[PDB]
Amino acid sequence: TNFAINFLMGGVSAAIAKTAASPIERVKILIQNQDEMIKQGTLDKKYSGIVDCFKRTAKQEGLISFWRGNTANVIRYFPTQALNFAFKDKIKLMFGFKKEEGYGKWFAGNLASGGAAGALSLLFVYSLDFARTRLAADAKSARQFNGLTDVYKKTLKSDGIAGLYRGFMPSVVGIVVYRGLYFGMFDSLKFLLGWVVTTGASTCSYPLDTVRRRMMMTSGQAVKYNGAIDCLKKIVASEGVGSLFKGCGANILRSVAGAGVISMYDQLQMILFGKKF
Ligand SMILES: C=C1[C@@H]2CC[C@H]3[C@]4(C)C[C@H](O[C@@H]5O[C@H](CO)[C@@H](OS(=O)(=O)O)[C@H](OS(=O)(=O)O)[C@H]5OC(=O)CC(C)C)CC(C(=O)O)(C(=O)O)[C@H]4CC[C@]3(C2)[C@H]1O
Numbered sequence: 001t002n003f004a005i006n007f008l009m010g011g012v013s014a015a016i017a018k019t020a021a022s023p024i025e026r027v028k029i030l031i032q033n034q035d036e037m038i039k040q041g042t043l044d045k046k047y048s049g050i051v052d053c054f055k056r057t058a059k060q061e062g063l064i065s066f067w068r069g070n071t072a073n074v075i076r077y078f079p080t081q082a083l084n085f086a087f088k089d090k091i092k093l094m095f096g097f098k099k100e101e102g103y104g105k106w107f108a109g110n111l112a113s114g115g116a117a118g119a120l121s122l123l124f125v126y127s128l129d130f131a132r133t134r135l136a137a138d139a140k141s142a143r144q145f146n147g148l149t150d151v152y153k154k155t156l157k158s159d160g161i162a163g164l165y166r167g168f169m170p171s172v173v174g175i176v177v178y179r180g181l182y183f184g185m186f187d188s189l190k191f192l193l194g195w196v197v198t199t200g201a202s203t204c205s206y207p208l209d210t211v212r213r214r215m216m217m218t219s220g221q222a223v224k225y226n227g228a229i230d231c232l233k234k235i236v237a238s239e240g241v242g243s244l245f246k247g248c249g250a251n252i253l254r255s256v257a258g259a260g261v262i263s264m265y266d267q268l269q270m271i272l273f274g275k276k277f
Contacts, residue, residue: 023066069135167212
C-alpha cells in the first residue's frame with residue numbers, strides 16, 4: 001500500500017509546487033513567445049517586461065487567468081512518475097558505467113540515460129506540455145482556445161498528430177545539454193551552489209527551449225519553420241540573438257519561487273508525515 005500513497009502524495013507535493021509558481025511561469029511563456037503572438041494577431045503590442053506583462057494580463061483577463069493551463073502541469077505528474085518508477089533505474093543501468101572506472105564514460109552514460117529516458121517519457125507526455133504552452137500563450141483581447149480538450153481537438157483537426165509534437169527534437173537535445181551542463185558545472189564545484197548550477201544550466205540551454213516553444217506556437221498557423229535549425233537561424237536573423245533569451249529572468253524567478261514553496265511544503269510535510277513524499 002506504501003507505493004500508492006507515496007505516489008498520490010508525491011503527486012500532491014509536485015502539484016502544489018508547480019501551482020504556486022504558475023503565474024510567473026505563464027508570464028515566462030508569454031514573454032518568451034510574444035512575437036509569434038504578434039504574427040498571429042493574438043497580441044496587440046510587445047511586452048516591455050515582467051511587470052508590464054503582469055499588469056496587462058491582470059487587467060485584461062484577471063487574477064485566476066495566471067493559472068491558465070496549470071491543469072496540464074498537475075496531470076503531467078502521474079504518467080511521468082509511472083514511466084520513471086518503471087524504466088528509469090533500468091535505463092540507468094543500461095547506459096551506465098561505474099564512476100570509478102572513468103569520467104568520460106560515466107558522463108556519456110548520464111547523457112545517454114537522461115536523453116533516452118526523457119525522450120521515452122516525452123513520447124507520451126509532450127502533448128501536455130504542448131497544451132500547457134498553447135493555453136498559456138493565447139490571450140484574451142476572444143480567446144484562441146476554449147480549453148485543454150479544445151487545444152487537442154483543434155490542433156489535431158488543423159495539423160494532426162504532428163501539431164501536438166512541435167519542437168520534439170530540440171526538446172530532447174535541450175534535455176541532454178541541460179543535463180550535461182548541470183552535472184558538469186555541479187561536479188566542477190565541489191547548498192546554495194546548486195541553485196547557481198541550475199540557473200546556469202537553464203540559462204545556457206534556454207535558446208533550445210525558446211525554439212521549442214515558438215515551434216509549438218507555429219502549430220495551427222499557415223506559416224511554420226522548416227525545422228529547429230531553420231527556426232533558430234530565422235529568429236537570430238530577424239530579431240537578434242538576445243531574442244532567444246526572452247523569459248529567462250522570469251524563469252529564474254520561477255526557480256526561486258518554486259524553491260521557496262517546495263522548501264516550505266517540505267517542512268510542513270516533515271511536521272505531518274515522518275518523511276517527505
Ligand atoms: C530545452 C529545454 C530546456 C532544458 C531542458 C528542459 C527541462 C529543464 C528538462 C528537465 O529534465 C529533468 O532533468 C533533471 C535533472 O537532470 C532530471 O532529474 S534526475 O533524473 O534525477 O537527474 C529529470 O529526470 S527524471 O527522470 O528524474 O524526471 C528530468 O525530468 C525528466 O526527464 C522528465 C521528462 C518528462 C522531461 C525537465 C524540465 C524541468 O524544468 O525540470 C521539465 O520538464 O519541467 C524541463 C523544462 C523544459 C526544458 C528547458 C526544455 O524545454
